């Protein structure tokens, strides 16, 4: 079918049809352009007109211009031939390596797996990260989320995890760059090449890359997630072997939606967000999941605007995770890295019948001392420690030592910490924390605990401090 | 003369988007009536305008297009109802989602029906035992009562609901039909895997048999999420209207409101305070008023509601949180501070209430916890007022000593809802000062030991307390004997 | 005249009349319904179309449906045969006891008494509640207001007042439940009966009931208060023997308006309220008043959204009252019931020339000490108590005691306190405080003062506490 461009406002192009009106979600191709310009149908305005969202810049478009009904929604190459490649929202290569020659194609819009399709197995996923493993352990085939205000550690954490987990996976991985920095895509790509995850020689790559960065128009940013998403779906259902899915940053998708929402002509909701915020997030999040057919371990970065965790975007996100790593600027400013808030991060796995009672007891142990310290803080703030009870002073010491012992150098952050990255084994963590709690180190100085791996190193650091 | 598509019982889509269809025709539709789309997709007639009908779509609007034929149904929205539903997982419309076959429903019910008036009810008087000491002792819940579970994300709101559903096996596996409690659990905006998790646990506990689970999850259309609570409600009234007893959990009304706000804004109804429709209050009042206790003239049945609300930054004074607090018969407020501190459940005694009072407690429990609430309040104060041992008398030292001991007793793990007599026995011990000399750190351990003793040895005292439902003079004597002696041996 | 329904959107229904447009406020009856559905005319849109507010559910209504102009605003059965009965927004019995056979009917809408109709008598109305009486005494025939956020005791207090006052009345009483809990209406009804205030067998009924609960559509809620008020005005004027008016909760009237306001096409005022908030309140509050013909003693419960006393609604209400009892969650949270805020409650009769200097000096004395203590609170909190002058550490004492002596176990809250309700007489109150202020109990412990009636009980409790 051939419609005509009736109106243009930013990424919202209205196209009129005479004989066949394309259904909602269909991808149209604008005629008379140097490069592909797909328009995704959003709604039927009536009058044989359809309101659509452009998948690329709309400059140059002219009223009256011809539009062609592709006859289907945005479809993209899916299969193993995507592994090691970089692709668009619309599935075109962007790595300058020729066409992605796949047998099948898949449309970005799909329904979420049904209820009967759900899975309930809960296995812990050890990361080697002290705070994570001890207080808010991830879980195989689970949903993980890394909350963080600007420049707090979301990305670094995603890298360290790709490093500590992705690298020794044995299965596939999909990295979806959503609304983030292009340089980052480039940084990862080349790095991936270097470590051999991406092989431009053989067919041995284990990662497929999808990107729709900070330079794309809203519509692109609003769909790349779906794109990356689809790629992963294929490996999950169509092949049966466990996938890994990294997204940086999923907040960008929601932001993108708000960018076009006014244009779509909707009465804004709270904070100027689109009234469809929750549903939008929902029909999308619901596809990022493990099922009886396959497993999807997903780590998503979630940017928090103005550092406000009550912002509708992040706020509505919590409900979709199985484990949440909330990063804090306050902690980061203290020099603690990763800047994870130990009293704000949670995990469904934190259950004695899953991590064991030793693990469950240390964890709650650490939290209770940190909570206690937190309450003392107001007073410490005006009057310092002097007026503190001998008993109280001991919680403060311990807390400040536990607080420090929670930090740790990442390989990925070596350039900044000035220390060699460390990977602590779960039992190592449970232990080192027990002792601290148990007053087995009330003699060592705080500093000894800062930036170290296993407790053993914290003892040594103490000697070196003399 | 093909007369099947006259504009009186049919209509044609003028435009569609964001789940809102603007149907032309439908000259005879009634407000709130269900229509049908060519695609078998159901809608709901919300705005009857001069030149068009604003239809709310119960599904993916992707299947709808301008021009589609819309057909009346002549029916105001309704759903399956009755015992067939027990042990099954349905969607916001009644359809099964557990892939366990069709529901054997013989009855139906309108989702939106006014709650029974003044005349058809009777004061709440029968307890609704949660199995949680803190709740059952301080913020008692009676049948036909509405008690709100409110707090921040992850404070343990759902858990309160699960323990309560699980605790019901006692009576359900029993003989007496009056004591039985059929449960309904409505998920709203929640996540499919979580719900799947949720129904697993229930199954593992052998609680699904008596539970219905209406699920309207994260990916479900706004209208489904929106309807969900009313649907589940109607299912519960079936029991209520038939001299049976039901318990309904609306987890949570926060996500429903959002759904409402969405559905509403998309219909172009001007946004109100905080962007919500001016009638959000009404959205919840209407619903929760349905939970009720019917008089013997109406079957003596009931409907008890436990709605969930999610605050932000522990702020209960917030508009929605206050809107809902002003409807229900009290609230259970959970704080994360309390939780991290080791107080689990994270119930905030001060801020929580039960507008039913002791009328919803057994005499045994009223006996032990009659004044405890105000006591604990007064304790929290002085506890504060002396965060500097300001030349403290005796009466206050005693106050502090009880306060702390009592607080430890109120603690409680998960999944182990206690029996009423068990509660009484343990509260008894503290309330009577028998523990005033034990070390606070010991209290938890003691309770486990003690409770072991009485359960195993003394089930004669337990069954009497439970049976008589009161604490007779001798029972009160046999008990004093037991605690004091056991305590002594215990502090060896 | 007969109009047709042209549009339906929630509680608002537009009607098109071919001939003769029903005036604003007129009540129309929807044709073809199992139940009576009244539409109150709200506006004249033009084009022979009126915008209305439904007094009930709008489900099933159909475009084109028939509507008859009743030719008059909502009129309800008013008179003595209302006593002992339960009424609707539209004057329909809802107690299943058959018709209400009144001689006359009255329109719920009506002008407020003229300026020259006002009264100025001011007699204290003793309640038996320590706090109220001491600090913010009610006045016979005056306007009383009970302010509070969710679950602070607005209702309970209203309950104790019915008990300690309504019961020994000797005149009529009207209780209008506006947008409150249905459960409550049932509790109250059955209580009135069990206490003979309501008599189902004879004509001894001393109280008429009117209900428009939370399970109603905004339209009903925007009107029940009028219905209830209308009943009450009758006993004031037509008969005149002194009436007690109870409304719970008047906020609901305001929130009802706000709920349909957007559908009426209005730019919202601050805090989402309708722009006509104040005036709406005015033309209503103005009828709730004592006149030369009769006397009304109105006790209205007033909801405080989000606990913010500055909220346009609670804020706008203050002016209409003569006495105000402010309840506080902060106080409540402490276990102090009634949760009245001693420094935020007021009464027009708190005048030496009216209650006398003893009452006056005590009250003020009690207030000064609490204020004094409030000031210190935050300070000792951090800096401790040592550095405090013995002079100052005695007010800390006394204040803490008074703070307690202000509490009281209500008769209506036994299920709550686990204590037998106490009713203290005015002189027992003034005296007890007088003494505490006078240093006459610096020996007893605070706790002794908590949850007791008269000072003697505090002394007794001390001993009992002595061990
Ligand atoms: N684990 C870490 N150890 C040490 N320094 C770190 C760590 N994580 C982050 N930083 C420092 O903080 C900077 C920002 O980290 P990064 O992970 O890029 O934050 P981000 O949340 O991804 N920021 P943005 O995406 O801009 O909001 C890094 O370049 C480091 O200088
Ligand atoms: N009594 C208890 N003792 C110990 N842990 C508990 C208790 N009750 C709940 N929990 C745990 O506390 C956490 C919070 O429980 P949950 O009931 O999900 O809170 P919530 O407010 O529903 N969270 P969310 O639904 O994510 O906002 C879970 O990990 C529970 O296992
Ligand atoms: N005077 C009182 N004495 C003891 N408890 C009270 C008192 N007033 C209120 N409470 C507690 O507060 C709860 C809420 O009171 P209520 O009158 O329902 O508040 P409101 O009507 O102001 O929302 C009661 O159910 C009871 O538990
Ligand atoms: Mg980043
Ligand atoms: Mg929950
Ligand atoms: Mg009330």
Short mmCIF file of C-alpha atoms in Angstrom, two decimals, chain B residues 25-32 46-50 52-53 76 114-119 121-123 146 269-270 273 278-279 281-282 285-286 289 317 322 325-329 350-351 354-359 370-371 374 377-378 381-382 385 388 399, chain C residues 6-9 56 58-63 86 94-96 150-151 180-183 185-187 189-190 211 214-218 221 252 255 259 262 271 303 306-307 311 333-337 373 380-381 384 396 400 404 415-419 447 450:
data_model
loop_
_atom_site.label_atom_id
_atom_site.label_comp_id
_atom_site.label_asym_id
_atom_site.label_seq_id
_atom_site.Cartn_x
_atom_site.Cartn_y
_atom_site.Cartn_z
CA UNK B 25 -22.91 3.88 16.03
CA UNK B 26 -23.72 1.66 19.06
CA UNK B 27 -26.84 3.79 19.46
CA UNK B 28 -28.31 1.47 22.04
CA UNK B 29 -25.28 0.76 24.25
CA UNK B 30 -25.60 1.41 27.95
CA UNK B 31 -22.82 3.06 29.90
CA UNK B 32 -20.45 0.41 31.25
CA UNK B 46 -16.99 4.16 29.30
CA UNK B 47 -17.81 7.48 27.55
CA UNK B 48 -21.17 7.72 25.87
CA UNK B 49 -20.82 10.87 23.78
CA UNK B 50 -23.15 12.58 21.37
CA UNK B 52 -19.26 8.46 19.52
CA UNK B 53 -18.66 5.87 22.21
CA UNK B 76 -22.98 -4.85 31.78
CA UNK B 114 -22.74 -1.60 45.28
CA UNK B 115 -21.74 -2.80 48.71
CA UNK B 116 -24.49 -3.90 51.08
CA UNK B 117 -26.13 -1.08 52.98
CA UNK B 118 -26.60 -0.43 56.67
CA UNK B 119 -29.45 -2.88 57.24
CA UNK B 121 -24.88 -6.09 58.14
CA UNK B 122 -23.89 -6.83 61.73
CA UNK B 123 -20.90 -5.64 63.79
CA UNK B 146 -10.77 -4.29 56.02
CA UNK B 269 -10.58 12.89 31.30
CA UNK B 270 -8.72 15.81 32.87
CA UNK B 273 -4.17 15.89 41.97
CA UNK B 278 -10.29 13.35 40.62
CA UNK B 279 -12.10 10.20 41.73
CA UNK B 281 -10.62 7.84 46.35
CA UNK B 282 -13.92 6.68 45.01
CA UNK B 285 -13.87 3.19 48.46
CA UNK B 286 -16.40 1.59 46.15
CA UNK B 289 -16.86 -1.14 50.94
CA UNK B 317 0.94 10.84 55.09
CA UNK B 322 -4.02 8.61 53.27
CA UNK B 325 -6.06 4.70 55.12
CA UNK B 326 -9.30 6.63 55.37
CA UNK B 327 -11.41 3.79 54.03
CA UNK B 328 -10.15 0.66 55.73
CA UNK B 329 -10.77 -0.46 59.32
CA UNK B 350 2.48 3.26 67.07
CA UNK B 351 1.30 3.92 63.51
CA UNK B 354 -7.42 -1.74 64.17
CA UNK B 355 -10.73 0.04 64.21
CA UNK B 356 -12.34 -3.22 65.35
CA UNK B 357 -10.46 -3.49 68.58
CA UNK B 358 -10.87 -6.45 70.91
CA UNK B 359 -14.24 -7.26 69.45
CA UNK B 370 -6.11 -5.91 76.33
CA UNK B 371 -3.91 -3.00 77.27
CA UNK B 374 -1.11 1.66 74.63
CA UNK B 377 3.19 3.25 72.81
CA UNK B 378 3.97 4.75 76.15
CA UNK B 381 8.10 7.39 74.22
CA UNK B 382 10.01 7.00 77.47
CA UNK B 385 12.87 10.38 76.59
CA UNK B 388 20.05 9.83 78.26
CA UNK B 399 8.13 0.41 81.97
CA UNK C 6 -27.43 12.70 25.11
CA UNK C 7 -24.20 11.95 26.93
CA UNK C 8 -22.98 9.88 29.84
CA UNK C 9 -19.59 10.13 31.44
CA UNK C 56 -26.72 7.25 41.85
CA UNK C 58 -25.01 5.58 35.80
CA UNK C 59 -24.55 2.02 34.59
CA UNK C 60 -26.96 0.85 32.00
CA UNK C 61 -28.03 4.38 31.05
CA UNK C 62 -28.47 4.72 27.32
CA UNK C 63 -28.17 7.56 24.91
CA UNK C 86 -32.93 6.02 58.05
CA UNK C 94 -33.29 2.68 53.61
CA UNK C 95 -34.22 0.84 56.73
CA UNK C 96 -36.86 -1.43 55.21
CA UNK C 150 -6.93 9.41 58.87
CA UNK C 151 -7.63 7.31 61.98
CA UNK C 180 -18.14 7.67 55.65
CA UNK C 181 -18.01 3.93 56.38
CA UNK C 182 -21.16 1.85 55.88
CA UNK C 183 -20.04 -0.47 58.68
CA UNK C 185 -23.83 3.44 60.00
CA UNK C 186 -24.81 -0.05 61.04
CA UNK C 187 -22.86 0.16 64.27
CA UNK C 189 -28.07 2.40 64.23
CA UNK C 190 -27.92 -0.73 66.32
CA UNK C 211 -26.85 8.36 55.04
CA UNK C 214 -18.33 5.89 50.77
CA UNK C 215 -19.97 3.36 48.57
CA UNK C 216 -21.89 6.06 46.77
CA UNK C 217 -21.17 8.01 43.64
CA UNK C 218 -19.84 11.60 44.07
CA UNK C 221 -21.90 12.43 48.42
CA UNK C 252 -16.70 14.35 52.15
CA UNK C 255 -14.23 15.96 48.14
CA UNK C 259 -14.55 14.47 42.10
CA UNK C 262 -13.36 18.32 35.98
CA UNK C 271 -4.31 21.47 45.36
CA UNK C 303 -11.06 15.12 57.52
CA UNK C 306 -2.40 14.10 54.04
CA UNK C 307 -2.52 15.38 57.57
CA UNK C 311 -5.06 21.90 52.84
CA UNK C 333 1.11 7.95 68.08
CA UNK C 334 2.14 8.41 71.74
CA UNK C 335 -0.86 6.51 73.00
CA UNK C 336 -2.49 9.68 74.27
CA UNK C 337 -6.25 9.50 73.55
CA UNK C 373 8.04 22.17 77.53
CA UNK C 380 17.34 18.58 76.18
CA UNK C 381 17.04 15.94 73.51
CA UNK C 384 20.77 16.50 77.87
CA UNK C 396 9.50 19.30 82.44
CA UNK C 400 4.84 15.39 81.32
CA UNK C 404 -0.97 12.47 80.71
CA UNK C 415 -12.49 -2.19 72.80
CA UNK C 416 -9.49 0.00 72.26
CA UNK C 417 -8.02 0.97 75.55
CA UNK C 418 -8.95 -1.99 77.68
CA UNK C 419 -10.14 0.55 80.24
CA UNK C 447 2.31 6.92 84.81
CA UNK C 450 -2.04 8.20 82.36
#
